[PDB]
Every structure is written in C-alpha cells, then in structure tokens.
C-alpha cells in the first residue's frame, strides 16, 4: 500500500553538477530517504585517488627540482587533487614525462589502456627553462574513505626505497550533495511528494550509479534488521616432560607425582616438592639446574591450564 519511488527525469547540469529526481514518494519518506542517501554518499563512496608518486631526481618532499616553478611539497598538493577513472584494475601506474616551456598538465600523461582523466587542464607543475625535464611515476588506487599517508603501515611491510613519496588519499568522489523536497505533479492522487538530489562530484562517478550504490549499501545495512531474532601460551611451556634430559631417579618420581608437562613443574615452589619421597637434595639441584638452563626458574604462577 506504499508507492515505490522510481528514479526518473535525471538531468545533468555540468560535467560535475548533477540533479537526480525521485518522483513518487509518500508523506514523510522524502526527508528520510534524502538524509539517508546524503549521509551514505558523503561518508562511503568508491573512488580513485593518487596513493604514492616517484619523481626522478628528488629524495623527499621537502626538496626542490631545478627548472620547475614549484616545490615538491606543492607538487604533491596539486597531484592530490588529480581525479582519474580506472576500469577493471586498482593499481594503475600513471607515468608522465614532459620537457620544454610552459605548464605541465594531466593532458600529457601517457595514454594508458583504460584510464580517463576527467579534466585535462589540471596543472601540476610549471617548467621555466628549455633544457630541464621532469619525469615522474604516479600510482593511483581505489578506496572508500579518507586514508592518511602516516596512518597506513601495511604498505611498509616491504621496504620503501628512498625516493618513494607518500601522499594522502581521499578516495571520495562526492564533494557536495544537497536534497530538496517538493510536491509532486500527480493530481489523481491527493498529495504526493517528489525528491530531487543535487549532487556535485569531481566527475569520477555517475550520479545514477552513485544513487544506486547508496541504495544498495542502505539495503545491505538494513538486511540485519529485517530478521532480528536473537531472543599457558608460550611455546616453551606445554612441552613433554621427558625433554629435559633428567636422571633415571627423577623420571619415576615425576610419574608418581604425575608431572607430565613442563609447566606443571615450574609452578612448584622450592619448599613443597622437597616433601616428595626420595626426591634427593642433589637431584633437586639437577632439576633446578636444567630448568635454569632454559631460563625457567621454580616458583612461577599461571592462571589457566588446558589439558593439552
């Protein structure tokens, strides 16, 4: 008995601006859907952003290159705003080389297989003499949210050679999104509601695909509601007892006392095992001696003892 919204009359204003219309809506559902979609789109949207770069002659971000008009730190900031669209891959490498006089933009990036630069006038550096050159290799990745360069550590599992520059990643193609609620033009129904979602991205995502992604994210999140219901670690320990090359006399004594594991012996303080029959003062020293060789002195205290 609830009308279902249909994504109709989608119109595009510019290469970034976009308006998506949801014609049939009920009384109060317009604001609910608009807020949910806006939060989903602003929070978690897939996108591509530059992860790390490699310039030929630089060593770190706080240096300069002869012949260029900008610092390497500045160049990283102009690169951070570069937006790309990759198809079928996630670790695309964007190598660019340029020589001469004038600004160097994304239009001169080498033409890879399937990578679309949304805007080709995005300047990243300027050249100031005829004979200087700039050769850099840019790596772009795909992500979901804001990932600072400092926070990530898994990228350091393999050592990064001196010269690899780390740049923060944003991964969010949606920069601004606002919704509006009006009255639908349907007159046969008494009063109906329509929703228009003005969305401003960097051109990396399709507005209809963005709305679809938000809707499926919301549906998968809500899937958990439609069915509520619901109404001794060290390797040195846990070892066989007959591994400490003890004497014959201690072997039978331990069996009678039932010390079948190493950790059971280490928990016995010196004042109590001496009461065991035929333990032996010199033999007791032998047990202490071999256990001191492993670094396991008598008198420790454990908490939990699994049978195995």
């Amino acid at each position: 008995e609830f009308l279902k919204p249909r994504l109709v009359d989608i119109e595009q204003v510019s290469s970034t601006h976009a308006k998506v219309t949801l014609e049939p809506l009920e009384r109060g559902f317009g604001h609910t859907l608009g807020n949910a979609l806006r939060r989903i789109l602003l929070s978690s949207m897939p996108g591509c952003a530059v992860t790390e770069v490699e310039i030929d002659g630089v060593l770190h971000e706080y240096s300069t290159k002869e012949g260029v008009q900008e610092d390497i730190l500045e160049i990283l900031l102009n690169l951070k705003g570069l937006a790309v669209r990759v198809q079928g891959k996630d670790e695309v490498i964007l190598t660019l080389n340029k020589s001469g006089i004038g600004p160097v933009t994304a239009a001169d990036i080498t033409h890879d297989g399937d990578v679309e630069i949304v805007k080709p006038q995005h300047v990243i550096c300027h050249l100031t003499d005829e004979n200087a050159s700039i050769s850099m290799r840019i790596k772009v990745q795909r992500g979901r949210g804001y990932v600072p360069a400092s926070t990530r550590i898994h990228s350091e599992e393999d050592e990064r050679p001196i010269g690899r520059l780390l740049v923060d990643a944003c991964y969010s193609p949606v920069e601004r999104i606002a919704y509006n609620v009006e009255a639908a033009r349907v007159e046969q129904r008494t009063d109906l509601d329509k929703l228009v979602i003005e969305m401003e991205t960097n051109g990396t995502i399709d507005p209809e695909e963005a709305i679809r992604r938000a809707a499926t994210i919301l549906a998968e999140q809500l899937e958990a509601f439609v069915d509520l219901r619901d109404v001794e670690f060290d390797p040195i320990l846990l070892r066989p007892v007959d591994d400490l090359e003890l004497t014959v006399r201690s072997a039978n004594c331990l069996k009678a006392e039932a010390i079948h594991y190493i950790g059971d012996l280490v928990q016995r303080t010196e004042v109590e095992l001496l009461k065991t029959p035929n333990l032996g003062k010199k033999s007791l020293t032998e047990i202490k001696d071999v256990l001191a060789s492993r670094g396991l002195s008598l008198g420790m205290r454990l908490e939990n003892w699994p049978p195995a």
């Binding site: 806006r38 939060r39 602003l42 929070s43 601004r176 999104i177 606002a178 919704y179």
Partner: peptide, 13 residues
C-alpha cells in the same frame, strides 16, 4: 567530526 555530521545550509555546504 565527519563531514556528514556538520550542519549544512540549503545549498548543502
């Protein structure tokens, strides 16, 4: 605070 929690005007900024 995240971006989606800050108050926004009519245009969405």
């Amino acid at each position: 605070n995240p971006i989606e929690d800050m108050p926004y005007d009519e245009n969405g900024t």
